[PDB]
Amino acid sequence: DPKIVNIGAVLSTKKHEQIFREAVNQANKRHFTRKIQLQATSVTHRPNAIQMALSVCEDLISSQVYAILVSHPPLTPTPISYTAGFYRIPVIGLTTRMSIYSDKSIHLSFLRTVPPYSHQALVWFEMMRLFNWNHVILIVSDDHEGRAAQKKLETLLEGPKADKVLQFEPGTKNLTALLLEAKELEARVIILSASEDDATAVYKSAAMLDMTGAGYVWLVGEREISGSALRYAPDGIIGLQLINGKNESAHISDAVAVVAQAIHELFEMENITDPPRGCVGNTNIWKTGPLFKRVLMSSKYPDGVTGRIEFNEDGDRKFAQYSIMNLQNRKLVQVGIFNGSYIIQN
Amino acid sequence: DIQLTQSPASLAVSLGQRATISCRASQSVSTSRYSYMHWYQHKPGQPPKLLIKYASNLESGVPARFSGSGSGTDFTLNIHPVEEEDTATYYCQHSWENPYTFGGGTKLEIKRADAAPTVSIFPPSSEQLTSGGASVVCFLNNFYPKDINVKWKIDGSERQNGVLNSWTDQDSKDSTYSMSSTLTLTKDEYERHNSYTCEATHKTSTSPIVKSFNR
Amino acid sequence: KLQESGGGSVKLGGSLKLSCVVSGFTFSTYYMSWVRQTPEKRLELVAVINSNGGNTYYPDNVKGRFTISRDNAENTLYLQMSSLKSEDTALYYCARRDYDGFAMDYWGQGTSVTVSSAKTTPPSVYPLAPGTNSMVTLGCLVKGYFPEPVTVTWNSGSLSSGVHTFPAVLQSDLYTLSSSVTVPSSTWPSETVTCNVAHPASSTKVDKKIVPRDC
Amino acid sequence: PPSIGIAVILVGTSDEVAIKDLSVVPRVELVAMNETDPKSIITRICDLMSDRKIQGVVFADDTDQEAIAQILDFISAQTLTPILGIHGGSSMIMADKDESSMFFQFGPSIEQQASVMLNIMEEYDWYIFSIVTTYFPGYQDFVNKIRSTIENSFVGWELEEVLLLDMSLDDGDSKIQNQLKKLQSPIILLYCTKEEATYIFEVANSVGLTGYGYTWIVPSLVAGDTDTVPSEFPTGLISVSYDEWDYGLPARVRDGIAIITTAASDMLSEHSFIPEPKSSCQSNMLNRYLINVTFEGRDLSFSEDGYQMHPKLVIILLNKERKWERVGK
Identify each DSSP E strand in C39-129 by its residue range: 42-49, 56-57, 66-71, 76-82, 90-96, 106-107, 111-115, 124-128
Coil vs helix vs strand at A196: helix
Q: Do chains A and D touch (3 or more CB pairs under 8 A)?
A: yes
Partner residues linked to C94 by β-bridges? C34
List the CATH code of the domain at B119-213.
2.60.40.10
Buried (b) or exposed (e) across A257-283, using 16+ Cβ within 10 A?
A: bbbbbbbbebeeeeeeeebbeebbebe
* Fold for the domain defined by C124-209: Immunoglobulin-like (2.60.40)
Spatial contact of A231 and A327, defined as CB atoms under 8 Å apart: no
DSSP C146: B
- So where are chain A's domains? 1-115+249-320, 116-248+321-346
| Phi, psi for residue A37 in degrees, rounded to 5 | -120, 150
Q: What are the residue ranges spanned by the domains of chain C?
A: 2-115, 124-209
SS3 D280: coil
Domains of chain D: 1-107+242-311 (3.40.50.2300), 108-241+312-329 (3.40.50.2300)
Which residues, at least 6 apart from D121, have a Cβ–Cβ distance to it below 8 Å? Answer: D127, D129, D187, D217
The enclosing H or E element of D264 equals: helix D249-271
- Taking the C-alpha atoms of residue A146 and residue B168, their distance in angstroms, rounded to an integer, is 54
All residues at 6 or more sequence positions from B157 whose CB lies less than 8 Å from its CB, including other chains? none
Q: Is B98 on the interface with D (CB under 8 A)?
A: yes
What is the DSSP annotation of B132-164? TEEEEEEEEEEEBSS--EEEEEETTEE--TTEE
Query: Rounded to an integer, what distance in angstroms lies between the CA atom of residue B86 and that of residue A25?
Result: 65
The experimental resolution of this structure, in angstroms, equals 4.6
Which fold, B4-110? Immunoglobulin-like (2.60.40)
Q: How far apart are CA C31 and CA C77, in angstroms?
A: 10
Residue whose C-alpha is closest to residue C128's, from B119, B215, B141, B127: B127
Chain D residues in contact with C49 by the CB 8 A cut-off are: 272
CATH number of this structure's domain A116-248+321-346: 3.40.50.2300
ω into residue C101 within 30 of 0, thus cis? yes
- B47 Cβ neighbours under 8 A, 6+ residues apart: C93, C107, C108, C109, C110
In the three-class reduction of DSSP (H, G, I as helix; E, B as strand; rest coil), residue D203 is classed as helix
Nearest CA in chain C to D269: C55
Chain C contact for D175, CB < 8 A?
Answer: no
φ, ψ (nearest 5 deg) of residue B179: -140, 140
Are the C-beta atoms of residues A127 and A133 closer than 8 Å to each other? Answer: yes
Contacts of C48 in chain D (CB under 8 A): 272
The number of angstroms, rounded, from the C-alpha of C55 to the middle of its chain's C-alpha atoms is 29
Nearest CA in chain C to B94: C103
Question: Which positions in chain C touch D283 (Cβ < 8 Å)?
Answer: 100-102
Tell me the β-bridge partners of B168: B178
Contact predicate A92/A107, CB 8 Å = no
Cβ atoms within 10 A of the Cβ of D244, count?
21
To the question of domain A1-115+249-320 being in CATH 3.30.465.10, the answer is no
* Assigned superfamily of C2-115: Immunoglobulins (2.60.40.10)
C176 forms bridges with which residues in the sheet?
A: C143, C169
Chain discontinuities in chain A, listed by preceding residue (C to N exceeding 2.5 Å): 74, 158
Q: Which residue spans within A85-160 are E strands per DSSP?
A: 91-93, 110-112, 135-141
3-class state of residue A190 by DSSP: strand
Rounded CA gap, A50 and D47, in Å? 13
Q: Is the peptide bond before C135 cis (omega within 30 degrees of 0)?
A: yes
How far is the C-alpha of B90 from the C-alpha of B95, rounded, in Å? Answer: 17
Taking the Cβ of residue C215 and every Cβ of chain B, the question of whether any pair is shorter than 8 Å is answered with no
Cα dihedral angle (A249, A255, A258, A262), rounded to 10 degrees? -140
Sign for the CA dihedral angle at A208, A210, A214, A217 comes to: negative
The angle subtended at Cα A63 by Cα A61 and Cα A65, nearest 5°, is 60
- Hey, is the C-beta of C97 within 8 angstroms of any chain B C-beta? no
Question: Are D67 and D89 contacting, i.e. CB atoms less than 8 angstroms apart?
Answer: yes
Same fold, A1-115+249-320 and A116-248+321-346: yes
Enter the DSSP assignment of D301. Answer: P
Interacting residues of B31 by C-beta distance below 8 A, sequence separation 6+: D287, D288
Instruction: Please count the other Cβ atoms lying within 10 Å of the Cβ belonging to residue A181.
Output: 13
Feature table: binding site of D for Zn(2+): 87, 244
Rounded Cα gap, residues A51 and A278, in angstroms: 15
Q: What is the CA radius of gyration of chain C?
A: 21
Of A54, A106, A278, the CB nearest to D42: A54
Domain ranges of chain B: 4-110, 119-213
**Contacting residues for A186 by C-beta, under 8 A, at least 6 apart:** A135, A163
- Closest alpha carbon to B176 in B141, B144, B139: B144
